[PDB]
Design a protein around this ligand. Sequence first.
Ligand SMILES: O=C(O)c1ccccn1
Ligand SMILES: [Ca+2]
Lengths: 336, 336
Amino acid sequence: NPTVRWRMSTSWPKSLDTIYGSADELCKRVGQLTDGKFEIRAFPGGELVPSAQNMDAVSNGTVECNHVLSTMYIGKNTALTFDTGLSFGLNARQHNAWIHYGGGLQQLRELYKKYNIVNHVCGNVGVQMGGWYRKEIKSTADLNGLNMRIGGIGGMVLSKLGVVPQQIPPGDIYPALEKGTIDAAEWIGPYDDEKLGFNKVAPYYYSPGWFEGSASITSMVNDKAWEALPPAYQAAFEAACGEQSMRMLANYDARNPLALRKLIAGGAKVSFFPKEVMDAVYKASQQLWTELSEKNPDFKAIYPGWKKFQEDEAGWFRVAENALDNYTFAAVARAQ
Amino acid sequence: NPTVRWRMSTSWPKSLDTIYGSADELCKRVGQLTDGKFEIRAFPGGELVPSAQNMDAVSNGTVECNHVLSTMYIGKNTALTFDTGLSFGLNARQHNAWIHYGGGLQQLRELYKKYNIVNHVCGNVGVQMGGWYRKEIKSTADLNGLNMRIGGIGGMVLSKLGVVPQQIPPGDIYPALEKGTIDAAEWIGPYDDEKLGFNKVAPYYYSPGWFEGSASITSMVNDKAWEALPPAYQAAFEAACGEQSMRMLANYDARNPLALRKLIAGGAKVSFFPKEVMDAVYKASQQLWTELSEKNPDFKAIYPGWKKFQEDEAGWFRVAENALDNYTFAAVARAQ
Ligand SMILES: O=C(O)c1ccccn1
Ligand SMILES: [Ca+2]
């Protein structure tokens, strides 16, 4: 097999040894699998192109691949939200099940042909936190008029409640929050959020980030770059992505607990969103799916099967996984 | 003309097709990664050696690797329980986090090296069910004298409450339930149980299966066979295992819900173990760990750190992950 050299434009700061670290691991593994012959170099967000351009830069061949949240690019097609995740959507396990064994990947591949891309799921961050605020969120009144940084489809939901959302890139969130040009910000969770500093300027940390059931990460590959690879190199990339689909989330799961404990020790006020706020955003989410199905044939094509899959998945996880986890987590706490 | 040729002795009949199929996928991916030059052939349980001998067969070099449930070999060393999962143990995500980012893999590698093995995690079954019961379980009194097909660690815990674990060939479980020779049987979960029709002869299908936690699947590799591989072939095996750690579970997550629907349509009564029963089996499990730790320094050395990891994980998952999943699963049910 030949020597192949690619650039991977990520959307993340190097400081995030979780999500960026996973991109680096992916590249390293592809190298190992090919004796260094398939060399992919990852670049932090903003280095090669602004992260807002990471999809376009893959479609036009500027870079061979990226490492992104696909719904940053929601302005291209709202059906991209099936790739990243829907609000109150599938959890990480259920999402990977839908993708690989429920027909999701093939439906997304068809979508991505419109953009000269071959997509691969390559990570997940799980259920996100609800973000950082300067005041208590007691009711939906506290969301009306809020200038909030939020990535993904959740912005579209929150706009219905009067939030003014923006997908400001990660490295730019803290300076805006610090300056006060945004009032609130969500990123991912305790480990990453501590790295970026939001707790220094915002006292309240809410949970859960309903914004996605899980935030799944995608590597978009230029379709001509993909085609040019020999079969073993395609397999290397696929397997490395499948592996990071476990490993990235495993790193978050390992690292987040201590980070939260430290955030609380340092003064963060951690609270659940009130039930009434949860109900309001849930209802707004359901209204959004009705709208997107009516307006976007690509969303309409995927939604019904996706919805049936969620219904089946949720029913089963409620019976077994969650029956056990809810019991065990409480028993472990009592025993502590 | 392969460069390396290995045999993989699995513990499964091909009819356990989610698990055996994953072993096949693993071997196929390794072939893809190496243009067929690292050839691994999988074999069903018993074809090369009995499944009970799969660990020793690898230790002795009879075969290069296996595909097994490590708790089958707890008679050799009870610390192997940490590889597969403890009763009321980690969930699948938490186990993979412990293994890859929490120090678990290194602790298990040190244990396995003494048996001439390099171990890799390569799958997870997810939470299984509590089994098929002819009669309702209302309290721990109903466990005393219960003749239940169950083994391993679950049997050891339940025996403390007066259950009499039963050993019976797989094809004899259905007729044994039909005749009332046994009162109850655990097999696996909906996908596999559906093929055997236990619902037709023992309608109460109890949840959750706490017995095995979220059982992880291991490939034990002979250490000299492992060391003899070219590094790209080591990486191929590692990556294929990391990938199957996601894919096997994804396939069970996709498959189990349809099977559960079929079981319910055949008369399965999904039932939940009462709180009093759950508390009693949790307590009995903790007594077992105390005893295993007192008897085996290898178990004692791992347990406290594993327990702390579980406490840390449970504390964090309660904040966001389970907060959202519990909300969503309930909402999805209402909308359906
Ligand atoms: O832009 C975001 O909000 C983001 C990106 C990656 C993962 C989760 N969230
Ligand atoms: Ca986010």
